[PDB]
């Protein structure tokens, strides 16, 4: 049902509410764009090149997880080759973290000051989020409260 699997795909990406002619026109954009590439390298390596860029900017264990799944997905190759193409298109606690004070046999470390320095940035981002909200909540409504009479109002636009 390859002629239908493109028809069901065009429904999901259609945002819910003419919804009867847009699907007819969006199926054109699906075909008008599918045959441009057709007119005109291993698989796991492309993940590692993205695994590297993970570890550099921190978040090591997540990168050790991305490789943990592709190792069990072996025991389909063309599917992961599609996900690596859309890697950047997406939209933008645990106390048993470092916590040298809990464990069975925790090894000697001495002060770190590189875990407490990335434990105050975990808090500084919190107070900087709940402050942009109050900057994006008093702005979205004062831009309407003070304007020309009848701009932001939809009933006056009739």
């Amino acid at each position: 049902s390859i002629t239908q699997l493109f028809d069901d795909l065009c429904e999901a990406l259609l945002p819910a509410a003419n919804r009867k002619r847009a699907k007819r026109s969006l199926k054109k954009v699906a075909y008008n764009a599918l045959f441009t590439n057709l007119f005109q390298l291993p698989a796991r390596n492309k993940i590692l090149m993205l695994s590297f860029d993970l570890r550099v900017g921190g978040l090591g264990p997540k990168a050790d997880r991305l490789e943990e799944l592709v190792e069990e997905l072996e025991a389909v190759g063309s599917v992961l080759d599609l996900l690596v193409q859309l890697a950047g298109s997406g939209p933008p606690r645990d106390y048993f973290l470092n916590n040298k004070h809990v464990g069975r046999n925790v090894p000697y470390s001495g002060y770190d000051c590189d875990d407490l320095s990335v434990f105050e940035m975990d808090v500084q981002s919190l107070i900087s989020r709940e402050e942009c909200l109050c900057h994006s909540m008093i702005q979205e409504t004062l831009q309407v409260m003070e304007a020309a009479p009848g701009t932001g109002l939809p009933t006056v636009g009739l």
Binding site: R44, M49, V56, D114
Partner: protein
Amino acid sequence: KSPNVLLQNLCCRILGRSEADVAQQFQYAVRVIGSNFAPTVERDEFLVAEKIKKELIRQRREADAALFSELHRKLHSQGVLKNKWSILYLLLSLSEDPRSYATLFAQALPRDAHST
């Protein structure tokens, strides 16, 4: 290029293979290089120089210890190299003697004293 694609050329130079063949080693090279990217010791080419002379003198090769001093100046004469400490720190490590204790002698500073 980027360091991630560049690390794979290295695994194809040392091991003679194609990138579709050798992918277990390149999985081990991303593990070590990554999470160990930032330099850990204060960088100075002076200290690394006085350790490549001290090493070529120790092999009774006192003539090449004074030739390196003339090759290390030319590097500064041309000026296309930004980090001269790194490439010497590496060339010294891969050095083999054609034919003990190191907590007594001069070691690089730790960078832990500073608030990195």
